[PDB]
Amino acid sequence: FVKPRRPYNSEGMTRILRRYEEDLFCTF
Amino acid sequence: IEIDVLCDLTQRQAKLYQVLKSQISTNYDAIENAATNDNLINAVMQFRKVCNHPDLFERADVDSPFSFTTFGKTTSKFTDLIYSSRNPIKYSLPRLIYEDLILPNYNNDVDIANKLKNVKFNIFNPSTNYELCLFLSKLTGEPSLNEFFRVSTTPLLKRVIERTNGPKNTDSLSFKTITQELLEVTRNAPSEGVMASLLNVEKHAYEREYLNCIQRGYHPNVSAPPVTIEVLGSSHVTNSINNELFDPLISQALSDIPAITQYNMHVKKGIPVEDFPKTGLFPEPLNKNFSSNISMPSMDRFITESAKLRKLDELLVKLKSEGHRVLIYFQMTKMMDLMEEYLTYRQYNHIRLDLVHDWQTNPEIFVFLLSTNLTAADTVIFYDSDWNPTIDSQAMDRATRQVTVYRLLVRGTIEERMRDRAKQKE
Amino acid sequence: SLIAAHSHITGLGLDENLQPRPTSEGMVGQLQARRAAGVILKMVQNGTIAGRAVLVAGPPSTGKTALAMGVSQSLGKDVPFTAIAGSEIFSLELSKTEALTQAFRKSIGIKIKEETELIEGEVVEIQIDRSITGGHKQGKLTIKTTDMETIYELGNKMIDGLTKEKVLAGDVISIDKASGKITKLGRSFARSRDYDAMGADTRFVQCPEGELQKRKTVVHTVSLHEIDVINSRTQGFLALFTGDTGEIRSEVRDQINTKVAEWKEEGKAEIVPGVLFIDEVHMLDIECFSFINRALEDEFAPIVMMATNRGVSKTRGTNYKSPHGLPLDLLDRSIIITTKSYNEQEIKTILSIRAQEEEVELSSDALDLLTKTGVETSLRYSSNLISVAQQIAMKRKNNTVEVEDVKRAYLLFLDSARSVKYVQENESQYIDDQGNVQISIA
Amino acid sequence: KSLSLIAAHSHITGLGLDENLQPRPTSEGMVGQLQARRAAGVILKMVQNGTIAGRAVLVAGPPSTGKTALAMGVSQSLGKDVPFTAIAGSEIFSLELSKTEALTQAFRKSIGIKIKEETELIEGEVVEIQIDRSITGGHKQGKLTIKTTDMETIYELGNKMIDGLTKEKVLAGDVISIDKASGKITKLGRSFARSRFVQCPEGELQKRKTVVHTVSLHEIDVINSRTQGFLALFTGDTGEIRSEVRDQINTKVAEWKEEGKAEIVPGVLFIDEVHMLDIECFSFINRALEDEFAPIVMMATNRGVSKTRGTNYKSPHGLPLDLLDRSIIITTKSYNEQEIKTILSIRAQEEEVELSSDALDLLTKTGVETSLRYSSNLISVAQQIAMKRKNNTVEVEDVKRAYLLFLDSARSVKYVQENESQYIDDQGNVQISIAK
Amino acid sequence: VTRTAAHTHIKGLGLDESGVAKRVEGGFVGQIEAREACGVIVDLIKAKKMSGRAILLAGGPSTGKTALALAISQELGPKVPFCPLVGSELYSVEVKKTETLMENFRRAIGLRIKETKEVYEGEVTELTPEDAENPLGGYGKTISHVIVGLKSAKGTKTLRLDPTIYESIQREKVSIGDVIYIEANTGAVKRVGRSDAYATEFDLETEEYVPLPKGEVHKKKEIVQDVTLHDLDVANARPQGGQDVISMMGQLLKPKKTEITEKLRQEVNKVVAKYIDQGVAELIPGVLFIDEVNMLDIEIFTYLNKALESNIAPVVVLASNRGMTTVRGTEDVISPHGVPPDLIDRLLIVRTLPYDKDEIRTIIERRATVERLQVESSALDLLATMGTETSLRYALQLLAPCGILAQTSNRKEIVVNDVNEAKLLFLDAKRSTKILETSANYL
Amino acid sequence: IVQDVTLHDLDVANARPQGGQDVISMMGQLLKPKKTEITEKLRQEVNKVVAKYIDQGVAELIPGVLFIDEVNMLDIEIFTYLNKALESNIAPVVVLASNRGMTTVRGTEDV
Ligand SMILES: Nc1ncnc2c1ncn2[C@@H]1O[C@H](COP(=O)(O)OP(=O)(O)O)[C@@H](O)[C@H]1O
Ligand SMILES: Nc1ncnc2c1ncn2[C@@H]1O[C@H](COP(=O)(O)OP(=O)(O)O)[C@@H](O)[C@H]1O
Ligand SMILES: Nc1ncnc2c1ncn2[C@@H]1O[C@H](COP(=O)(O)OP(=O)(O)O)[C@@H](O)[C@H]1O
């Protein structure tokens, strides 16, 4: 069986998000 | 079908050969036919265990520098650690030296002379020497006139750490040279830039010469802490050297605050972002292999460090249609290490000591390791250690109807000497 | 780039049977020296004999450096060729043995074979998450093609390579895993969002087809000295460029020798031996010659090419006088290629080849005059006069350089012997060796 | 003793002198040079008196007459707790320090301060350690049962002891020594509970002790010179210590001696092959002995009327005249046959198994003929070729074999003289080829 | 296939059991008494009880002193250290010459140690810090404890580290889901790679993937190591390896060779003696080869006669090429082999003798077989005549070019025409000197 | 904007570490700069990227003269280095000035 993906602990962080239509920025 | 392959001695095998060939007076005992004749026997088994492979008689452990320490060891719901590595060299000082030279005392004059030489007569003092401070304020364009007194009375590492990003006055004589303007104009610059690509050749040499995937070639042999200083009967010395070895500004500057902690002060405790103790100033190493001096034992180095296992894994890469057997009496019943080798990396359907019936129903599971009428196996690899072909023929008698012979040899070792006498006997 | 004194030599001018052609590959003359140099070149190309000292001897203006540079040209790319001079050893930060050892380690090369992986596709979505101070970074990159789409994780170096030369969703980039390079091929989606900051929009490319992950194997060459300095300190990669490497211990030398032999036997590394060329080797010291005669006896030592233009001269640092300035123990190790002076036809061929490389249309009688000048004075003077005569012809607006330009150039600029006679005629005007002069006309 | 293999001066355990300084003919490994040995005994009693400051003695004589043996005998008979520094003439030419700076450091390494300090120490065996680690907050508590042969007691431990015992993880039965002032425990070992090992400590826990500390003035100078820590004493980058901190340390040492909490112990500085120092070094030595904090300097030279380095004229003993004026000279003589026999007997007795007597006579004849040191070097290789013949004793024929193989100086010089074109001369001329 | 380095034909001294020399063994031809003396010296090394014994290999060029030194190293074995040197090595622009000499002296002395290290390793399932109480105060760290979950086969433990350990943990960029390796001796930690329990086909950082480590956590592993005494000295002088700011800052600086004080050497000797008596250390004294000892000046020899008379100093062997020459660093002392008479009394001279024609011929034959070129008999005899006539070395170096000319001539055989062409293309020292003499261009 | 730089400016810009701001570069900025032996690799990479942007057509290279006065006073090893530095590809013209006549070269005995 295909192994699970690695856990993605991103708590405590700002976020840059760039998408097809528009780019975001989540900050604190 | 009979085939023979001869192999060259690998580097670690040859150095093990030489270091255990030296002794005091070996007189080349194993190739003096001591194995044919019947201490000599201990040298014979030592030469055999060396001449096959190193890890069949001692484990290739981790590669680490020698820890020159005296740390807290044991004799063997959480177990905790405190860093307690110390050098074995203990420099012992009398208490009179410290308490009469370093610390202030009523009969000592350390603090008085310290202030008198560092504050009362410092030439950057604005209370006494204004015009000199105003002179340098005109020169360097400093916003504050106490900054020269601050720079003159600060340790170098501490003064390096609290680096100020504030721009200077614009009427200064500090005229920024063209190299600084070149460096600042490319500080955050894209690719395909004419001034951008001129000023980074180390990143071009990095990407061109593939330095991101190179391996560590050198590790130090001995690593040590700083030599401990042991003054008896005072806690001030303990506090002082514990503060100097672990200064929280210097230690925190070579550090990084965890991300959820930065959440905690920035949001939960409301600490402003610029008032964080600064981190991340430790230099980045060249690669992930260059981070630490400890080298893990690699599986691929086990594969490649043997004269015979390298050509053996080459052969089972080539041989798929015929199940094969190994005479494990080349090392006198050593099943263990080849077992770890071929279920660690070269994993296959396998059987090793109802047992004889499992490999005849299908050839997908090979007969593999057995110690020597079961000729139903497709082939058998019986290769060397035969100074007598009688056990060779009795092993191949046990063994489909077709029998195939795979012979292995190492040149320069005892196999050439027993396997040139037994070659004419065949 | 620019035309230099050795612009014309492209090879050793040598046939496949190790016999020199009369005029080929930008070379003429010195047939026995060319054959011996080709033999040394074939020795290097075999690459199984280490530490063979080769010495070149001859008068000045004979073609010693031309022979060595022709060896370097015909030697082929990606095989090292150091071209040090004798004076560069004497340093204030290294020892002379240390400088010789570093030149030796520079001359020997390793061809590392590395397995890499190439991905190329249309970028879907970036999810860079950074800490508050920005020090620690982790992200997720999403990339697709016409066939399939994959979600990859991100590290520190890949995120900082995405930030610099900034990549938006809608771009087609190519990433090499082993080197960590980022190559934005262009913008494919042409998204409707147009921020007023972006003024440099990359050219449109068709979004790629096929599988993203393509297996690739590449080879790169790194010399022994570079690996030595890389493993020497924590920041060793800077010391290649700043040159602040120095007095490197023998421990890293022996450990890297063992590791290099390890990479050799597992098939990662294929050592190519190189050539160290020491022009004007008579400039060196006796300690350097001692280290040289004891340094060729290792497996990691290249073919050493040495040049001199001295007769029986004083060996430096010593009272005695030795052939070629080199002591007898070193001279016994070396094998000597000799060179002999030219004649009128070879000199004529030299200036014809030079003027072809100097883009000068020279007339035949001016060529004859230049050959007579070159035989009369030196080859280098008649080589140097061609560009000056070309400039003089350019000032008179004639393309072909004629005899009067050659005579005007000869009158304007002085060679060695005429300058010697002009000094000897009125020596009181120049400052004497005893520091005596007369600066007044009366 | 540290790690010590057999060396040249290993048999010398001190001056073989009686109570009235009269030398015994053979005692403590040393034989002969009775006038020189009596002089060295007088100098030893000077140093052991410790009331005389800054005298220089010059041990001059022929090579291989025991000058270095005399100095090693003085150093061995001095014992420990008195500083001794043996340097050579080629040490002080430093690439970072000046010559006078290196001489000043070597002068101040051989002057020592003796301090008596009384500390506190608790050392026993742990019967049982318990911690009531119910950490509702940062506070924790625990109890420790520590035992010796005459003690058995329980302690209530504060938080800092719990922190100090969490690291250096003490189990039950381990032997620990606790410093109460600094909170540093040392794990000496585990007691006899096998069912590294150390004996269980004797009684009277919490026993004060006096540890007598002797430090040199160079270490105090390095410490008081503020920008160099004590790591300069190991790294060697002390780097031109200023004169004012030296003056401060001298005044503080005089204050400590007067007020009686420190005692000054003079030592001996030995300079082997003093003839290689420059005239500047001779001037600094010439004016360096007038300081009160100056040791007793020993100088050894084996040169005749030779040039002084840095000048162009010749002077006796390789030293200038004023330095010869400021030093008393100990003379040493060469050895006759019986002294060579006794020295070879002692060295062969210590170094290896016994010799046959005719072989010892052949060694004595060779030592008289060529050199003492050559015979002493022949001893071991003759024994090794005797082991290769598989015999215990060393016979005459093993000595003959070793004499055939290993040449002395005279045979090498002569054989160089008959084979001249095969070798390289001053002018760099050599006939490598053997034909014509 | 394998590169020849002018000494690959030498495998050992070639002696028999009783110390006599076979005429052909180990690639040695002749030099019987020299080989016997060097075998006696090898036996003296394997005795491992002497200190400061020295020999000088006197002889001319093309004779075999360097060959005898590497023969000693081959016979002794790679376990006992061998430190080759040239006399020009001792002059350094960064430190004194004498300290370079003693650093080579303690490079020669070896050590055999066996050490047990407390080792924590396993897969990081949990990694949660604990925040400090007063973070902006700055006199403490920003954290107080870090709880780490380590999982491996057969055991699983939770780890409450001090912040100073977490410094190295964050410096190796340890994330959740990789196999790590904490060495509790020094506090160093090595991040092996990402664990293969999860998916391994989606990273972009060419990470290596490792299985779960076998055995429990808190493995106590005993390893065996071979170090030199100089390496202990250079580790204690420049203290890299601790987790204090002195050690972390000492890693980053460019190292300079410093004058290592004697006090450090006595402390290292005391620690090593404690390791000897405790039972994990065994001393391995070695051999140091100073080739070209004529190049050393008077200061090194003057310090050498005192440095050889210490209790720990190894056996040094010396080579000299010159006869009755003046000593460097002085202008009046005329002395054999460039060695002053003070040092020569400590020294045991081993003479080496020049060669005959048959020895030269056999040396050429063995060197041709080692370089894998077969020769013809008349060409070998011609090369032997040139070796007698010019030098042995010139006949040795000419072997490869006639082989090159033979492959040029589309054959594997060396003939006398190839030897004559090697004569015509390349010249020895004598013909070059005569060509310099006849020419007036200062050729 | 047209900016004019020398090749030594590019070499000294690439040699000192730009960016990073991680202890080592900041200590290098605060301490005194040290002239260091710039290796051939840095100059070769600089020449490579400069030739690349020359072949692009956006950069223009212009050689300038170098005037060395009192050239009688250089040591012999400087002339020995200059013999092959003059033969290099990118090195410009150099103008030499001397006033002495029949004299010995500095650094040698009787030339
Ligand atoms: N065989 C040749 N082919 C091409 N050019 C040559 C040849 N011989 C000499 N030259 C020219 O002669 C000049 C001197 O040669 P070079 O070796 O550089 O200096 P020198 O001979 O003084 O050492 C060079 O400029 C070179 O171009
Ligand atoms: N009186 C003596 N007693 C014992 N051994 C001696 C005596 N004199 C000399 N030796 C030995 O002779 C050897 C060489 O003597 P050495 O001390 O070098 O003489 P010098 O100091 O005069 O050069 C040393 O091993 C030393 O032990
Ligand atoms: N006894 C010997 N047997 C075989 N070859 C030798 C012998 N002695 C010297 N040689 C060869 O002669 C050459 C010179 O050896 P080396 O000792 O390095 O120089 P030198 O003999 O001048 O000291 C080496 O290449 C070696 O192969």
Could you give the CA distance from residue B230 to residue C20 in angstroms, rounded to a whole number?
78
Q: Which residue has the tokens 């069949």?
A: B56
Could you give the CA distance from residue D290 to residue D270 in angstroms, rounded to a whole number?
18
The radius of gyration computed from the CA coordinates of chain E, to the nearest angstrom, equals 30
| D335 in Cβ contact with D63 (< 8 Å) | no
Could you give the CA distance from residue C248 to residue C98 in angstroms, rounded to a whole number?
8
* 3-class SS letters over chain E: CCCECCCCCCCCCCECCCCCECCEECCEECCHHHHHHHHHHHHHHHHCCECCCEEEEECCCCCCHHHHHHHHHHHHCCCCCEEEEEHHHHCCCCCCHHHHHHHHHHHHCEEEEEEEEEEEEEEEEEEEEEECCCHHHCCCCCEEEEEEEEECCCCEEEEEECHHHHHHHHHCCCCCCEEEEEECCCCCEEEEEEECCCCCCCCCCCCCEECCCCCCCCEEEEEEEEEEHHHHHHHHHCCCECCCHHHHHHHHCCCCCCCCCHHHHHHHHHHHHHHHHHCCEEEECCEEEEECHHHCCHHHHHHHHHHCCCCCCCEEEEEECECEEECCCCCCCEEECCCCHHHHCCEEEEECCCCCHHHHHHHHHHHHHHCCCCECHHHHHHHHHHHHHCCHHHHHHCHHHHHHHHHHCCCCCECHHHHHHHHHHCECHHHHHHHHHHCCCCC
Q: And the tokens for E33?
A: 């008494």
| D220 in Cβ contact with D113 (< 8 Å) | yes
Which residue among D117, D223, D261 places its CB closest to the CB of B232? D117
Amino acid at D65: T
Q: And the tokens for F65?
A: 């003269």
Structural biology method used: cryo-EM
Amino acid at E82: F
* B residues 109-138 lying closer than 8 A (beta carbon) to E: none
**3-state SS assignment for residue B409:** strand
Closest residue (by CA) to atom 6 of ligand 2? D66
DSSP H/E element including D54: none
Please return the burial class of C59, using the count of CB atoms within 10 Å of its CB with bins 0-12, 13-18 and 19+.
middle
Residue C340 CA to ligand 1 centre (angstroms): 12
Amino acid at B175: F
DSSP H/E element including D330: strand D328-331
Q: And the tokens for D143?
A: 């109890």
A26 touches chain C (CB under 8 A): no
- Provide, as residue numbers in chain D, all residues whose Cβ is less than 8 Å from the Cβ of B75: 171, 174, 190
Go through chain A and tell me how many residues it has: 28
Q: C232 phi and psi, to 5 degrees?
A: -70, -50
Could you give the CA distance from residue C169 to residue E123 in angstroms, rounded to a whole number?
35
Q: Most A CBs within 10 Å: which of E176, E195, E207, as the mutation test of the A interface?
A: E176
Cβ-proximal residues to E100 (8 Å cutoff; 6+ apart), any chain: E89, E90, E91, E92, E257
- Which alpha helices (DSSP H) does B199-265 contain, by range? 202-208, 236-245, 248-253, 259-263
CA quadruple E4, E5, E7, E8: dihedral, nearest 10: -30
* C residues 236-295 lying closer than 8 A (beta carbon) to F: 238, 240-244, 279-280, 283
- Give the gap in angstroms from C-alpha C346 to the nearest C-alpha of chain E: 19
Residue D337: how many other CB atoms lie within 10 Å: 12
| D300 in Cβ contact with D270 (< 8 Å) | yes
Residue F8 CA to ligand 1 centre (angstroms): 30
For residue E63, give the ligand 3 atom closest to its CA.
Answer: 21
The reply to whether D26 sits in an annotated binding site is no
* 3-class SS letters over D219-238: HHHHHHCCCCCCCHHHHCCC
Residue C144: how many other CB atoms lie within 10 Å: 17
Closest residue (by CA) to atom 23 of ligand 1? C64
Which residue among C35, C48, C152 places its CB closest to the CB of E3? C48
Of the candidates B291, B300, B359, B278, the one whose C-alpha atom is nearest the C-alpha of residue B324 is B359
Residue of A nearest to C137 (CA): A13
Q: And the tokens for B378?
A: 């497709």
Could you give the CA distance from residue C190 to residue C207 in angstroms, rounded to a whole number?
11
The radius of gyration computed from the CA coordinates of chain C, to the nearest angstrom, equals 30
Could you give the CA distance from residue C4 to residue C18 in angstroms, rounded to a whole number?
28
DSSP state of D28: T
**3-state SS assignment for residue C351:** helix
- Give the gap in angstroms from C-alpha D19 to the nearest C-alpha of chain E: 30
Could you give the CA distance from residue D30 to residue D13 in angstroms, rounded to a whole number?
8
Of the candidates D222, B227, C252, D95, the one whose C-alpha atom is nearest the C-alpha of residue E237 is B227
Of the candidates B134, B75, B55, the one whose C-alpha atom is nearest the C-alpha of residue B298 is B55
Q: And the tokens for C365?
A: 């009688």
- Which alpha helices (DSSP H) does B177-331 contain, by range? 178-185, 194-198, 202-208, 236-245, 248-253, 259-263, 299-304, 309-318
Q: B359 phi and psi, to 5 degrees?
A: -90, 5
Amino acid at C251: E
Residue of A nearest to B259 (CA): A12
**3-state SS assignment for residue D122:** strand
Of the candidates E221, E273, E268, the one whose C-alpha atom is nearest the C-alpha of residue E115 is E221
Q: And the tokens for E398?
A: 């000419």
Q: Most B CBs within 10 Å: which of E70, E244, E266, as the mutation test of the B interface?
A: E244
Please return the burial class of D201, using the count of CB atoms within 10 Å of its CB with bins 0-12, 13-18 and 19+.
buried
Could you give the CA distance from residue C198 to residue E123 in angstroms, rounded to a whole number?
45
DSSP state of B301: H
Cβ separation B226–E239 shorter than 8 A: yes
In chain E, which residues touch A (CB < 8 A)?
176-177, 194, 196-200, 202
Asked if residue C61 has its Cβ within 6 Å of ligand 1, the reply is: yes
Beta strands at B79-80 and C275-278: parallel, antiparallel or unpaired? unpaired
For residue D72, give the ligand 2 atom closest to its CA.
Answer: 17
Longest Cα–Cα distance of chain E, Å, equals 93
DSSP state of B98: I
Among positive and negative, which fits the CA dihedral E155, E156, E158, E164? positive
DSSP state of C362: B
CA atoms within 13 A on the CB side of E197: 16
Cβ separation D187–B234 shorter than 8 A: no
Asked if residue C65 has its Cβ within 6 Å of ligand 1, the reply is: yes
- Provide, as residue numbers in chain F, all residues whose Cβ is less than 8 Å from the Cβ of C280: 80, 83-84
Beta strands at E189-195 and E209-210: parallel, antiparallel or unpaired? parallel
For residue C60, give the ligand 1 atom closest to its CA.
Answer: 22
Nearest ligand, CA D273: 2
Of the candidates C260, E181, D145, B192, the one whose C-alpha atom is nearest the C-alpha of residue F49 is B192
Q: Which residue has the tokens 């109570």?
A: D19
Contacts 24+ apart (CB under 8 A), E374-377: E374/E412, E374/E413, E374/E414, E375/E414, E376/E413, E376/E414, E376/E415, E376/E416
According to DSSP, the residues that pair with C221 across neighbouring strands are C111
Cβ separation C328–D426 shorter than 8 A: no
Beta strands at D406-407 and E24-25: parallel, antiparallel or unpaired? unpaired
Residue of B nearest to C253 (CA): B218
Burial E15-40 (b: 16+ CB within 10 A, else e): beeebebeeeebbbbbbeebbbbbbb
Burial D109-131 (b: 16+ CB within 10 A, else e): bbbbbebebebebbbbbbeebee
- Provide, as residue numbers in chain B, all residues whose Cβ is less than 8 Å from the Cβ of E140: 248
| B79 in Cβ contact with E216 (< 8 Å) | no
Asked if residue D248 has its Cβ within 6 Å of ligand 2, the reply is: no
The binding site of E for ATP consists of: 59-66
In chain C, which residues touch B (CB < 8 A)?
112, 114, 116, 131-133, 135-136, 157, 164-166, 178-181, 184, 200, 218, 220, 222, 227, 230-232, 234-238, 240-241, 251-252, 255-256, 258-262, 265-266
Residue of A nearest to B264 (CA): A12
Which are the residues after which chain A is interrupted (C to N > 2.5 Å)? Answer: none
Residue of F nearest to B284 (CA): F22
- Taking the mean position of all CA atoms in its chain, how far away is CA C115? 28
Burial F68-90 (b: 16+ CB within 10 A, else e): eeebbebeebbbbbbbbeeeeee
B163 touches chain F (CB under 8 A): yes
**3-state SS assignment for residue D264:** strand
Asked if residue D66 has its Cβ within 6 Å of ligand 2, the reply is: yes
Could you give the CA distance from residue C226 to residue B209 in angstroms, rounded to a whole number?
11
- Give the gap in angstroms from C-alpha A2 to the nearest C-alpha of chain C: 15
In chain F, which residues touch C (CB < 8 A)?
14-17, 24, 34, 36-39, 41-42, 47, 51, 76-78, 80-81, 83-84, 86-90, 99-104, 109
| D54 in Cβ contact with D293 (< 8 Å) | no
C163 touches chain A (CB under 8 A): no
Which residue among B62, B78, B225 places its CB closest to the CB of E244? B225
Which residue among F15, F51, F88 places its CB closest to the CB of C4? F88
Residue D246: how many other CB atoms lie within 10 Å: 18
For residue D67, give the ligand 2 atom closest to its CA.
Answer: 21
- For C2-43, the DSSP string reads ---TTSS--S--B-TTS-B-SEETTEES-HHHHHHHHHHHHH
Closest residue (by CA) to atom 20 of ligand 1? C61
Cβ separation E260–D6 shorter than 8 A: no
Could you give the CA distance from residue B345 to residue C106 in angstroms, rounded to a whole number?
38
Contacts 24+ apart (CB under 8 A), C23-27: C23/C349, C25/C70, C25/C74, C26/C353, C26/C357, C27/C66, C27/C70
Q: Which residue has the tokens 């490579």?
A: F48
Q: Most C CBs within 10 Å: which of D95, D422, D423, D432, as the mutation test of the C interface?
A: D432
DSSP state of B10: P
Residue E350 CA to ligand 3 centre (angstroms): 16
Q: What is the resolution of this structure in A?
A: 3.5
Could you give the CA distance from residue C49 to residue E397 in angstroms, rounded to a whole number?
10
* 3-class SS letters over C40-99: HHHHHHHCCECCCEEEEECCCCCCHHHHHHHHHHHCCCCCCEECCECHHHCCCCCCHHHH
Cβ-proximal residues to B420 (8 Å cutoff; 6+ apart), any chain: none
Q: And the tokens for C294?
A: 């004891």
Closest residue (by CA) to atom 27 of ligand 1? C6
**3-state SS assignment for residue D99:** helix
DSSP state of B225: P
**3-state SS assignment for residue D333:** coil
CA quadruple C218, C221, C224, C226: dihedral, nearest 10: -90
CA angle E102, E104, E107 (to 5 degrees): 115
